[PDB]
Amino acid sequence: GKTQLFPDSPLTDQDFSQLDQTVIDTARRQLIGRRFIELYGPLGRGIQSIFNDVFIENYEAKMDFQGSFDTDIETSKRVNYTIPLLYKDFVLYWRDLEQAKVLDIPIDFSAAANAARDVAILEDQMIFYGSKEFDIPGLMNVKGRSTHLIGNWYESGNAFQDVVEARNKLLEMKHNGPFALVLSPELYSLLHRVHKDTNVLEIEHVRELVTDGVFQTPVLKGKTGVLVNTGRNNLDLAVSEDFDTAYLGEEGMNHPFRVYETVVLRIKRPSAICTLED
Amino acid sequence: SPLTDQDFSQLDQTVIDTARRQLIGRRFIELYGPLGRGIQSIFNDVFISKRVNYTIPLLYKDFVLYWRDLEQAKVLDIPIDFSAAANAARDVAILEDQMIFYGSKEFDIPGLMNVKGRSTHLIGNWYESGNAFQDVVEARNKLLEMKHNGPFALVLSPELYSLLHRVHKDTNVLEIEHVRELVTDGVFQTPVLKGKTGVLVNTGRNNLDLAVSEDFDTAYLGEEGMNHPFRVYETVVLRIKRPSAICTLED
Amino acid sequence: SPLTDQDFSQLDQTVIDTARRQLIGRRFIELYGPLGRGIQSIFNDVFIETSKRVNYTIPLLYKDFVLYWRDLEQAKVLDIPIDFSAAANAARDVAILEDQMIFYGSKEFDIPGLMNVKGRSTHLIGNWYESGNAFQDVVEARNKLLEMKHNGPFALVLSPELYSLLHRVHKDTNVLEIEHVRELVTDGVFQTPVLKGKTGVLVNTGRNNLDLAVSEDFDTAYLGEEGMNHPFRVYETVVLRIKRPSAICTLED
């Protein structure tokens, strides 16, 4: 196992397994974008860049008697994306490890949770805004997406009207699949009032149209939201290496570790995204 | 055949799963078997008997796989991307649902919302409480007066389906739970219908059915410029035998 | 017969299912067995509050449909299942005729029906548009039936209009009138299109009050080839015996 990878590690196989379990459990509870985006299978270390095809037009099926000789294919542009690396560091102290070993006390993996939280926050930020250095577009700044302006959401019923208008805008472009809604926390809290007309909570009424769930993320500030047509053919996440931990070697009698992963986001059809902005 | 049998199997499964998750009409309409390729037209007897002939149409959509990506896939031993196949399969299902709910004006095939001999019900303002229940009850009464007492299915536009999500006055229950026992075959919604429209249909293979010749399938169009084009196709048609067993909630 | 055993079995199954899902009277009325074809008349003793014996003649109900040789030839060539569609229409028509005979009798054979027998109770209904009136009317009808030493499980049959009018919310109550009505009527509430307007019937069920004598159930017969086509006929022989006319209350306008 991980002991073979780092034979000079203070921990044992059980401790490494517990650390990995803690890291993955902390990562799972914090990842928002992975709740409605499919994962392209783990490729491996044999790749360092990916290819993305961006479409600009949509064609529908045809009805005929026997068929046709010509083949109709939409025009697409090919681009190259560089897979970035995201990582964080934490330290374990020798005195605490020795005391736990001599007292037969379970080891406290608290810094690993903070490292995993920071890595997850960085990944969410990259997904929702893109990497400026590598020039990778994000959900809220892609080119060719639809834009909607929201009104005053303090008055009851306005949010439902805005969501309906965004859905109509997305539907007029031959997009009928299930939708997902992501909001800033300030707007998310405003949906927990009582709809006077229907005598129900506004969030419950909104959840009827958005059948893939409504989520909120802290990376969005102020009045900000996005409506996305869920589908593998529309957007995807390519993962080279998932969340993992590495031992950096002893230094100053203290043992540092690193938590790292390599992911990227591919947007195929920018027309399947609507952004609700102030 | 650039792909081996495993890749073809995954392609077929991907197309089938993508199509099945989107189809609405197949959830409450029976199929008249996979007849085969030996038939090209069907006969319908409207029992009011009048015999008509319907020509079975063909629905298809094409996509393409490139060879560089495939070769890299076998080189690196990684799963093959099939996003284009799913994107193609979605549109075929959408077109099939549109044809089922509105028919083809060029093939001269009636749809559920425009067939002759049906019943029409004018709905009221659904923004209040209880109006939807009254409208559904009246539509079911109209259907019942025509010697039709069987399982019923209700299909609504998303706007009306959302409007149904309210509180039934004086009983403190959701109206949807008060409708699900009258309409014992379920309530469905589909984006095909626009505005405030709906349909109530008495199910049963003796009232209406779907005749299919070839189900969803994939065909290789042959190599072209070292690439690989593919086609996704199917041949289906809808027969309505008792037009009186349909009530359209219009506005 | 052009059909083999399998097609005959399928035809019988289709006719049986169509008849079973369409018959209303058979839901709350007992059957006096399959008697057979050795009996052509029955005896009914009416108790009036004594016994009067009356001879009833068993009628025959039938309807004909046809299969076209071109369709069976095409189905045989293409190896596709045959289409038994006219049989469903014939079975539906026969069932409708039987229900009409049960609820109104035959004037030719002077057999009384449920809504026109002599020695029954009649109740005049009010305006059922207002909430609560129907509950009061049903309660009063059951009270009328109660002061006759009749307390068995009751059954209610209504016209579709009255049946639909009953699906509102009871005034000053959370529940609908359907539940309150079904509380009193423990044998179910049925509706049929045979009744027209605002009419209904409340019947104290039981073998000793009324029953059905069936000499031959639903069956199919081959009439022989004609014009290369194939006609068939669906038929049955039933009759209704009412023994205690006092156990019926008819709601009329």
PDB file of C-alpha atoms in Angstrom, chain C residues 38-247:
ATOM      1  CA  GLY C  38     -81.513 -27.965 -20.130  1.00  0.00           C
ATOM      2  CA  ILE C  39     -83.581 -25.141 -18.617  1.00  0.00           C
ATOM      3  CA  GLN C  40     -85.540 -22.561 -20.606  1.00  0.00           C
ATOM      4  CA  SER C  41     -87.738 -21.019 -17.889  1.00  0.00           C
ATOM      5  CA  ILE C  42     -87.433 -20.206 -14.191  1.00  0.00           C
ATOM      6  CA  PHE C  43     -89.833 -19.701 -11.289  1.00  0.00           C
ATOM      7  CA  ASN C  44     -89.777 -16.652  -9.014  1.00  0.00           C
ATOM      8  CA  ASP C  45     -91.746 -16.384  -5.769  1.00  0.00           C
ATOM      9  CA  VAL C  46     -92.391 -12.760  -4.803  1.00  0.00           C
ATOM     10  CA  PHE C  47     -92.931 -12.034  -1.095  1.00  0.00           C
ATOM     11  CA  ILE C  48     -95.227  -9.049  -0.581  1.00  0.00           C
ATOM     12  CA  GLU C  49     -95.704  -7.607   2.903  1.00  0.00           C
ATOM     13  CA  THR C  50     -97.956 -13.895   0.607  1.00  0.00           C
ATOM     14  CA  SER C  51     -95.728 -15.693  -1.891  1.00  0.00           C
ATOM     15  CA  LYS C  52     -96.812 -15.329  -5.526  1.00  0.00           C
ATOM     16  CA  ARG C  53     -95.268 -17.669  -8.092  1.00  0.00           C
ATOM     17  CA  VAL C  54     -94.450 -16.261 -11.537  1.00  0.00           C
ATOM     18  CA  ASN C  55     -92.854 -17.972 -14.535  1.00  0.00           C
ATOM     19  CA  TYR C  56     -90.033 -16.112 -16.291  1.00  0.00           C
ATOM     20  CA  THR C  57     -88.629 -17.028 -19.702  1.00  0.00           C
ATOM     21  CA  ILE C  58     -84.862 -16.716 -20.136  1.00  0.00           C
ATOM     22  CA  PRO C  59     -84.030 -14.314 -22.995  1.00  0.00           C
ATOM     23  CA  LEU C  60     -81.001 -14.511 -25.282  1.00  0.00           C
ATOM     24  CA  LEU C  61     -78.593 -11.628 -25.888  1.00  0.00           C
ATOM     25  CA  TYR C  62     -76.194 -11.666 -28.826  1.00  0.00           C
ATOM     26  CA  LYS C  63     -74.140  -9.520 -31.191  1.00  0.00           C
ATOM     27  CA  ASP C  64     -72.264 -10.357 -34.391  1.00  0.00           C
ATOM     28  CA  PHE C  65     -68.852  -9.331 -35.721  1.00  0.00           C
ATOM     29  CA  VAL C  66     -66.774 -10.266 -38.760  1.00  0.00           C
ATOM     30  CA  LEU C  67     -63.169 -11.057 -39.683  1.00  0.00           C
ATOM     31  CA  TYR C  68     -61.880 -10.254 -43.178  1.00  0.00           C
ATOM     32  CA  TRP C  69     -59.809 -12.923 -44.927  1.00  0.00           C
ATOM     33  CA  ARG C  70     -57.272 -10.404 -46.250  1.00  0.00           C
ATOM     34  CA  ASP C  71     -56.199  -9.455 -42.721  1.00  0.00           C
ATOM     35  CA  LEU C  72     -55.672 -13.033 -41.535  1.00  0.00           C
ATOM     36  CA  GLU C  73     -53.822 -13.878 -44.753  1.00  0.00           C
ATOM     37  CA  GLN C  74     -51.488 -10.905 -44.295  1.00  0.00           C
ATOM     38  CA  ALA C  75     -50.940 -11.758 -40.622  1.00  0.00           C
ATOM     39  CA  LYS C  76     -50.134 -15.375 -41.491  1.00  0.00           C
ATOM     40  CA  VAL C  77     -47.699 -14.326 -44.223  1.00  0.00           C
ATOM     41  CA  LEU C  78     -45.926 -11.701 -42.101  1.00  0.00           C
ATOM     42  CA  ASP C  79     -46.140 -13.771 -38.874  1.00  0.00           C
ATOM     43  CA  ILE C  80     -47.713 -11.039 -36.746  1.00  0.00           C
ATOM     44  CA  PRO C  81     -50.421 -11.351 -34.079  1.00  0.00           C
ATOM     45  CA  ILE C  82     -54.034 -11.122 -35.195  1.00  0.00           C
ATOM     46  CA  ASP C  83     -56.171  -8.085 -34.350  1.00  0.00           C
ATOM     47  CA  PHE C  84     -59.260  -8.978 -32.307  1.00  0.00           C
ATOM     48  CA  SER C  85     -60.841  -5.523 -32.197  1.00  0.00           C
ATOM     49  CA  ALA C  86     -64.450  -6.010 -33.325  1.00  0.00           C
ATOM     50  CA  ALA C  87     -64.894  -8.639 -30.609  1.00  0.00           C
ATOM     51  CA  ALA C  88     -64.295  -5.961 -27.976  1.00  0.00           C
ATOM     52  CA  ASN C  89     -67.015  -3.767 -29.490  1.00  0.00           C
ATOM     53  CA  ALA C  90     -69.444  -6.692 -29.618  1.00  0.00           C
ATOM     54  CA  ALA C  91     -68.725  -7.595 -25.989  1.00  0.00           C
ATOM     55  CA  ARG C  92     -69.184  -3.975 -24.905  1.00  0.00           C
ATOM     56  CA  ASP C  93     -72.527  -3.758 -26.707  1.00  0.00           C
ATOM     57  CA  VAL C  94     -73.724  -7.032 -25.168  1.00  0.00           C
ATOM     58  CA  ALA C  95     -72.692  -5.884 -21.685  1.00  0.00           C
ATOM     59  CA  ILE C  96     -74.464  -2.545 -22.155  1.00  0.00           C
ATOM     60  CA  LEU C  97     -77.626  -4.338 -23.282  1.00  0.00           C
ATOM     61  CA  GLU C  98     -77.480  -6.690 -20.290  1.00  0.00           C
ATOM     62  CA  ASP C  99     -77.053  -3.782 -17.870  1.00  0.00           C
ATOM     63  CA  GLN C 100     -79.981  -1.962 -19.482  1.00  0.00           C
ATOM     64  CA  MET C 101     -82.134  -5.082 -19.143  1.00  0.00           C
ATOM     65  CA  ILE C 102     -81.133  -5.444 -15.485  1.00  0.00           C
ATOM     66  CA  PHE C 103     -81.919  -1.823 -14.642  1.00  0.00           C
ATOM     67  CA  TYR C 104     -85.142  -1.522 -16.667  1.00  0.00           C
ATOM     68  CA  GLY C 105     -86.392  -5.001 -17.622  1.00  0.00           C
ATOM     69  CA  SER C 106     -87.840  -6.189 -20.915  1.00  0.00           C
ATOM     70  CA  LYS C 107     -91.321  -5.060 -21.926  1.00  0.00           C
ATOM     71  CA  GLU C 108     -91.681  -7.905 -24.436  1.00  0.00           C
ATOM     72  CA  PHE C 109     -91.159 -10.523 -21.708  1.00  0.00           C
ATOM     73  CA  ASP C 110     -92.783  -8.270 -19.045  1.00  0.00           C
ATOM     74  CA  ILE C 111     -89.893  -8.758 -16.618  1.00  0.00           C
ATOM     75  CA  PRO C 112     -89.729  -5.889 -14.089  1.00  0.00           C
ATOM     76  CA  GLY C 113     -86.560  -3.902 -13.519  1.00  0.00           C
ATOM     77  CA  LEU C 114     -84.896  -2.258 -10.550  1.00  0.00           C
ATOM     78  CA  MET C 115     -86.213   1.229 -11.338  1.00  0.00           C
ATOM     79  CA  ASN C 116     -89.771   0.162 -12.214  1.00  0.00           C
ATOM     80  CA  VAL C 117     -90.657  -2.779  -9.942  1.00  0.00           C
ATOM     81  CA  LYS C 118     -93.854  -2.647  -7.884  1.00  0.00           C
ATOM     82  CA  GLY C 119     -93.568  -2.612  -4.108  1.00  0.00           C
ATOM     83  CA  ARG C 120     -90.502  -0.379  -3.708  1.00  0.00           C
ATOM     84  CA  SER C 121     -89.750   2.873  -1.908  1.00  0.00           C
ATOM     85  CA  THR C 122     -89.331   6.201  -3.704  1.00  0.00           C
ATOM     86  CA  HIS C 123     -87.488   9.298  -2.489  1.00  0.00           C
ATOM     87  CA  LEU C 124     -87.592  12.744  -4.095  1.00  0.00           C
ATOM     88  CA  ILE C 125     -84.172  14.394  -4.145  1.00  0.00           C
ATOM     89  CA  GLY C 126     -83.565  18.122  -3.780  1.00  0.00           C
ATOM     90  CA  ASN C 127     -80.846  20.357  -5.199  1.00  0.00           C
ATOM     91  CA  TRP C 128     -77.515  18.527  -5.020  1.00  0.00           C
ATOM     92  CA  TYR C 129     -75.481  21.569  -6.093  1.00  0.00           C
ATOM     93  CA  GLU C 130     -75.447  22.852  -2.512  1.00  0.00           C
ATOM     94  CA  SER C 131     -73.067  20.981  -0.228  1.00  0.00           C
ATOM     95  CA  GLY C 132     -74.611  18.607   2.298  1.00  0.00           C
ATOM     96  CA  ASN C 133     -77.938  18.033   0.537  1.00  0.00           C
ATOM     97  CA  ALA C 134     -76.810  14.721  -0.966  1.00  0.00           C
ATOM     98  CA  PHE C 135     -75.730  13.403   2.435  1.00  0.00           C
ATOM     99  CA  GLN C 136     -79.134  14.301   3.879  1.00  0.00           C
ATOM    100  CA  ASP C 137     -80.925  12.622   0.969  1.00  0.00           C
ATOM    101  CA  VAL C 138     -78.901   9.417   1.345  1.00  0.00           C
ATOM    102  CA  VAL C 139     -79.507   9.411   5.106  1.00  0.00           C
ATOM    103  CA  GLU C 140     -83.255   9.848   4.590  1.00  0.00           C
ATOM    104  CA  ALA C 141     -83.371   7.076   1.980  1.00  0.00           C
ATOM    105  CA  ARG C 142     -81.521   4.693   4.292  1.00  0.00           C
ATOM    106  CA  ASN C 143     -83.905   5.652   7.104  1.00  0.00           C
ATOM    107  CA  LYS C 144     -86.857   4.812   4.852  1.00  0.00           C
ATOM    108  CA  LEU C 145     -85.251   1.454   4.089  1.00  0.00           C
ATOM    109  CA  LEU C 146     -84.509   0.923   7.796  1.00  0.00           C
ATOM    110  CA  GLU C 147     -88.095   0.812   9.073  1.00  0.00           C
ATOM    111  CA  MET C 148     -88.723  -2.408   7.139  1.00  0.00           C
ATOM    112  CA  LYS C 149     -86.521  -4.819   9.146  1.00  0.00           C
ATOM    113  CA  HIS C 150     -83.768  -4.234   6.567  1.00  0.00           C
ATOM    114  CA  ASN C 151     -80.316  -3.467   7.959  1.00  0.00           C
ATOM    115  CA  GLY C 152     -77.886  -5.399   5.761  1.00  0.00           C
ATOM    116  CA  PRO C 153     -75.047  -3.927   3.719  1.00  0.00           C
ATOM    117  CA  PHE C 154     -76.434  -1.331   1.324  1.00  0.00           C
ATOM    118  CA  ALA C 155     -75.242  -0.484  -2.182  1.00  0.00           C
ATOM    119  CA  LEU C 156     -75.750   2.762  -4.092  1.00  0.00           C
ATOM    120  CA  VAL C 157     -75.800   3.244  -7.869  1.00  0.00           C
ATOM    121  CA  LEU C 158     -75.963   6.738  -9.354  1.00  0.00           C
ATOM    122  CA  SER C 159     -75.973   8.451 -12.716  1.00  0.00           C
ATOM    123  CA  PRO C 160     -72.612   9.930 -13.784  1.00  0.00           C
ATOM    124  CA  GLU C 161     -73.798  13.502 -13.172  1.00  0.00           C
ATOM    125  CA  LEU C 162     -74.785  12.827  -9.558  1.00  0.00           C
ATOM    126  CA  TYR C 163     -71.631  10.750  -9.071  1.00  0.00           C
ATOM    127  CA  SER C 164     -69.491  13.679 -10.223  1.00  0.00           C
ATOM    128  CA  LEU C 165     -71.469  16.168  -8.121  1.00  0.00           C
ATOM    129  CA  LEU C 166     -70.528  14.159  -5.011  1.00  0.00           C
ATOM    130  CA  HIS C 167     -66.778  14.870  -5.322  1.00  0.00           C
ATOM    131  CA  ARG C 168     -66.809  18.234  -3.528  1.00  0.00           C
ATOM    132  CA  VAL C 169     -65.781  19.141   0.017  1.00  0.00           C
ATOM    133  CA  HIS C 170     -68.412  18.696   2.714  1.00  0.00           C
ATOM    134  CA  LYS C 171     -69.391  22.020   4.252  1.00  0.00           C
ATOM    135  CA  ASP C 172     -67.942  22.700   7.718  1.00  0.00           C
ATOM    136  CA  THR C 173     -65.837  19.538   7.430  1.00  0.00           C
ATOM    137  CA  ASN C 174     -62.331  18.673   6.278  1.00  0.00           C
ATOM    138  CA  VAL C 175     -63.226  15.525   4.312  1.00  0.00           C
ATOM    139  CA  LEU C 176     -65.160  15.215   1.050  1.00  0.00           C
ATOM    140  CA  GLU C 177     -68.709  13.908   0.756  1.00  0.00           C
ATOM    141  CA  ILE C 178     -67.390  10.710  -0.866  1.00  0.00           C
ATOM    142  CA  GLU C 179     -65.950   9.415   2.407  1.00  0.00           C
ATOM    143  CA  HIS C 180     -69.032  10.298   4.459  1.00  0.00           C
ATOM    144  CA  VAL C 181     -71.331   8.634   1.922  1.00  0.00           C
ATOM    145  CA  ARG C 182     -69.115   5.538   1.728  1.00  0.00           C
ATOM    146  CA  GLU C 183     -69.262   5.303   5.524  1.00  0.00           C
ATOM    147  CA  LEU C 184     -73.011   4.625   5.371  1.00  0.00           C
ATOM    148  CA  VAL C 185     -72.927   2.543   2.171  1.00  0.00           C
ATOM    149  CA  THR C 186     -70.540  -0.291   3.023  1.00  0.00           C
ATOM    150  CA  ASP C 187     -70.848  -2.092  -0.337  1.00  0.00           C
ATOM    151  CA  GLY C 188     -69.461   0.726  -2.483  1.00  0.00           C
ATOM    152  CA  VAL C 189     -70.855   3.503  -4.659  1.00  0.00           C
ATOM    153  CA  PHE C 190     -71.124   2.770  -8.377  1.00  0.00           C
ATOM    154  CA  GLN C 191     -72.014   4.765 -11.472  1.00  0.00           C
ATOM    155  CA  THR C 192     -73.287   3.639 -14.862  1.00  0.00           C
ATOM    156  CA  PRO C 193     -74.226   5.521 -18.049  1.00  0.00           C
ATOM    157  CA  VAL C 194     -77.492   3.568 -18.358  1.00  0.00           C
ATOM    158  CA  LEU C 195     -79.196   5.877 -15.866  1.00  0.00           C
ATOM    159  CA  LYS C 196     -80.019   9.303 -17.293  1.00  0.00           C
ATOM    160  CA  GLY C 197     -80.534  12.606 -15.532  1.00  0.00           C
ATOM    161  CA  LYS C 198     -80.714  12.770 -11.739  1.00  0.00           C
ATOM    162  CA  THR C 199     -81.695   9.225 -10.784  1.00  0.00           C
ATOM    163  CA  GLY C 200     -80.285   6.670  -8.382  1.00  0.00           C
ATOM    164  CA  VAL C 201     -80.985   3.399  -6.620  1.00  0.00           C
ATOM    165  CA  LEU C 202     -80.177   2.156  -3.106  1.00  0.00           C
ATOM    166  CA  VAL C 203     -80.415  -1.613  -2.659  1.00  0.00           C
ATOM    167  CA  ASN C 204     -80.080  -3.822   0.416  1.00  0.00           C
ATOM    168  CA  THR C 205     -77.886  -6.572  -1.008  1.00  0.00           C
ATOM    169  CA  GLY C 206     -78.168 -10.248  -0.148  1.00  0.00           C
ATOM    170  CA  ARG C 207     -78.975 -13.541  -1.849  1.00  0.00           C
ATOM    171  CA  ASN C 208     -82.427 -13.665  -0.236  1.00  0.00           C
ATOM    172  CA  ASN C 209     -83.492 -10.319  -1.758  1.00  0.00           C
ATOM    173  CA  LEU C 210     -82.420 -10.450  -5.414  1.00  0.00           C
ATOM    174  CA  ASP C 211     -80.127 -12.501  -7.625  1.00  0.00           C
ATOM    175  CA  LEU C 212     -79.204 -13.409 -11.195  1.00  0.00           C
ATOM    176  CA  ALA C 213     -80.007 -16.717 -12.893  1.00  0.00           C
ATOM    177  CA  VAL C 214     -77.533 -17.471 -15.692  1.00  0.00           C
ATOM    178  CA  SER C 215     -78.164 -20.418 -17.986  1.00  0.00           C
ATOM    179  CA  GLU C 216     -75.194 -19.744 -20.285  1.00  0.00           C
ATOM    180  CA  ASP C 217     -72.443 -17.196 -19.688  1.00  0.00           C
ATOM    181  CA  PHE C 218     -70.621 -15.139 -22.317  1.00  0.00           C
ATOM    182  CA  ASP C 219     -69.622 -17.326 -25.246  1.00  0.00           C
ATOM    183  CA  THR C 220     -68.575 -17.138 -28.891  1.00  0.00           C
ATOM    184  CA  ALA C 221     -69.931 -19.128 -31.834  1.00  0.00           C
ATOM    185  CA  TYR C 222     -68.811 -19.475 -35.451  1.00  0.00           C
ATOM    186  CA  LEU C 223     -71.587 -18.794 -37.968  1.00  0.00           C
ATOM    187  CA  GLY C 224     -69.751 -20.354 -40.917  1.00  0.00           C
ATOM    188  CA  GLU C 225     -67.885 -18.832 -43.848  1.00  0.00           C
ATOM    189  CA  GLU C 226     -69.723 -16.281 -45.991  1.00  0.00           C
ATOM    190  CA  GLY C 227     -68.168 -14.370 -48.876  1.00  0.00           C
ATOM    191  CA  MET C 228     -64.711 -15.700 -47.913  1.00  0.00           C
ATOM    192  CA  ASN C 229     -65.140 -13.720 -44.683  1.00  0.00           C
ATOM    193  CA  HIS C 230     -65.715 -15.179 -41.195  1.00  0.00           C
ATOM    194  CA  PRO C 231     -68.602 -14.045 -38.968  1.00  0.00           C
ATOM    195  CA  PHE C 232     -68.798 -14.804 -35.258  1.00  0.00           C
ATOM    196  CA  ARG C 233     -71.482 -14.167 -32.647  1.00  0.00           C
ATOM    197  CA  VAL C 234     -71.137 -13.436 -28.921  1.00  0.00           C
ATOM    198  CA  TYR C 235     -74.096 -14.487 -26.798  1.00  0.00           C
ATOM    199  CA  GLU C 236     -75.333 -15.237 -23.293  1.00  0.00           C
ATOM    200  CA  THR C 237     -78.589 -16.042 -21.478  1.00  0.00           C
ATOM    201  CA  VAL C 238     -79.295 -14.391 -18.108  1.00  0.00           C
ATOM    202  CA  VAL C 239     -82.289 -13.172 -16.112  1.00  0.00           C
ATOM    203  CA  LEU C 240     -82.821 -11.162 -12.922  1.00  0.00           C
ATOM    204  CA  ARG C 241     -84.967 -12.407 -10.031  1.00  0.00           C
ATOM    205  CA  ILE C 242     -86.255  -9.870  -7.496  1.00  0.00           C
ATOM    206  CA  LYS C 243     -87.669 -11.632  -4.439  1.00  0.00           C
ATOM    207  CA  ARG C 244     -88.180  -8.784  -1.927  1.00  0.00           C
ATOM    208  CA  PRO C 245     -89.319  -5.582  -3.673  1.00  0.00           C
ATOM    209  CA  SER C 246     -89.398  -3.713  -0.344  1.00  0.00           C
ATOM    210  CA  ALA C 247     -85.568  -3.704  -0.220  1.00  0.00           C
TER     211      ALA C 247
END
